[PDB]
Amino acid sequence: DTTTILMLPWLGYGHLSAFLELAKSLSRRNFHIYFCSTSVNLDAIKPKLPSSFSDSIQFVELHLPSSPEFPPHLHTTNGLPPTLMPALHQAFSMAAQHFESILQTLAPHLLIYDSLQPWAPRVASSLKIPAINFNTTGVFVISQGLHPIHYPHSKFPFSEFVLHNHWKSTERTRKRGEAFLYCLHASCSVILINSFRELEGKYMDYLSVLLNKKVVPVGPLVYEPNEGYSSIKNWLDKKEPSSTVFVSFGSEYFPSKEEMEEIAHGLEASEVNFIWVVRFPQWAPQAKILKHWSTGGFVSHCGWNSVMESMMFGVPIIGVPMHVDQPFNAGLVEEAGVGVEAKRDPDGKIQRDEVAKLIKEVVVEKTREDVRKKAREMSEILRSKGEEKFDEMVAEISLLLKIEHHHH
Numbered sequence: 083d084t085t086t087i088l089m090l091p092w093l094g095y096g097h098l099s100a101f102l103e104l105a106k107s108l109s110r111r112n113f114h115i116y117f118c119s120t121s122v123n124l125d126a127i128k129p130k131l132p133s134s135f136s137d138s139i140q141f142v143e144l145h146l147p148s149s150p151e152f153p154p155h156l157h158t159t160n161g162l163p164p165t166l167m168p169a170l171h172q173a174f175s176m177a178a179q180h181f182e183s184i185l186q187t188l189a190p191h192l193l194i195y196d197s198l199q200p201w202a203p204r205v206a207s208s209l210k211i212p213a214i215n216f217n218t219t220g221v222f223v224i225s226q227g228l229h230p231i232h233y234p235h236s237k238f239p240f241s242e243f244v245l246h247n248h249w250k251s252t253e254r255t256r257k258r259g260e261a262f263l264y265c266l267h268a269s270c271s272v273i274l275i276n277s278f279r280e281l282e283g284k285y286m287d288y289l290s291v292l293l294n295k296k297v298v299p300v301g302p303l304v305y306e307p308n309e310g311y312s313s314i315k316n317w318l319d320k321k322e323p324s325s326t327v328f329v330s331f332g333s334e335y336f337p338s339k340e341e342m343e344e345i346a347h348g349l350e351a352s353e354v355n356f357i358w359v360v361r362f363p364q365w366a367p368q369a370k371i372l373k374h375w376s377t378g379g380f381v382s383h384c385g386w387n388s389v390m391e392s393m394m395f396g397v398p399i400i401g402v403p404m405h406v407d408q409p410f411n412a413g414l415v416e417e418a419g420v421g422v423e424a425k426r427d428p429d430g431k432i433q434r435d436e437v438a439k440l441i442k443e444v445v446v447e448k449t450r451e452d453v454r455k456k457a458r459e460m461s462e463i464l465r466s467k468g469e470e471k472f473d474e475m476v477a478e479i480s481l482l483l484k485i486e487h488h489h490h
Contacts (some may be wrong), residue, residue: 089101161364302394331383348441384415393420
């Protein structure tokens with residue numbers, strides 16, 4: 083009979099997008115995919131799965147405990163009030179017993195889990211089902227955290243990047259224990275990750291050594307669009323080449339009113355064209371917008387998907403980080419030469435004028451072209467990479483399932 087994989091993303095839009103792209107490729111390689119998340123997430127990613135995959139990728143609903151005031155359409159981090167974040171983690175924790183009922187019933191041959199379920203590799207070991215880890219974000223930020231663990235004294239070897247730590251609850255108590263999580267099977271001996279070596283080759287090689295694991299890259303996993311655009315195309319089509327920037331901040335961080343005020347001033351002082359329709363706690367075609375001639379700028383919060391999309395498309399990155407991984411991703415962009423970072427002032431807050439200085443210097447004015455060279459060059463290699471992108475991954479999955487075949 084055919085082979086089956088259960089895919090469990092973390093409950094976030096970026097994770098869902100990454101996991102669906104990996105789910106699609108595994109379908110094309112003659113695997114049966116069990117795509118498992120909550121009903122609200124499955125609905126939000128359902129549009130991106132074409133009707134040709136209906137027999138090879140099934141959506142399997144995970145039930146979080148619901149109540150009239152915390153109902154299922156809130157069982158996701160997308161658009162969720164931050165003060166409800168504790169409940170979502172609690173409700174997710176409690177979904178472990180149902181997830182086990184899913185594994186027992188489906189009896190998959192493999193579990194590919196996101197890096198945020200502590201109970202997913204623990205439940206899969208109980209049923210003797212191999213489970214591989216898939217990280218949807220970059221390796222560069224992970225090696226910065228594991229470097230003091232072994233080398234508190236040595237400087238970070240390959241990078242000269244530094245951070246303000248102005249960013250500086252009990253999650254860390256759980257995070258450090260993963261670093262020391264053991265491994266006596268081939269299922270955890272290799273991890274898949276959403277990056278490509280042209281961007282983070284040294285950091286994958288370094289991370290492979292710290293973790294004692296094989297770091298198999300399967301990135302970048304960017305989703306290409308197939309109205310909204312019709313109205314927006316009018317702006318892009320009319321304006322001359324390279325005169326606009328896009329402002330993206332994501333659906334999980336809602337910038338503070340002062341922060342939005344300081345950022346807004348960067349846009350006005352920069353005297354640049356702008357396309358921004360931000361959200362508030364409870365959409366736009368970002369990919370299509372990044373893929374127009376008029377587009378030569380991206381003022382992004384530097385989430386991994388936004389960083390990957392620009393490098394794939396070729397649009398220079400104006401970075402304004404303000405959350406967990408953004409500053410590192412933003413440091414990596416500048417090191418790579420494919421963008422510039424706006425160094426937020428020695429004060430805690432964002433510098434209103436610092437943002438404005440960079441947008442004009444990069445988009446309206448070709449003051450910095452060293453970056454533009456790097457943006458197009460990077461995008462050429464990404465598109466050049468084709469079906470070999472999943473070659474190394476398929477080989478390890480094949481080998482892993484064969485090893486476990488004897489352990490019975």
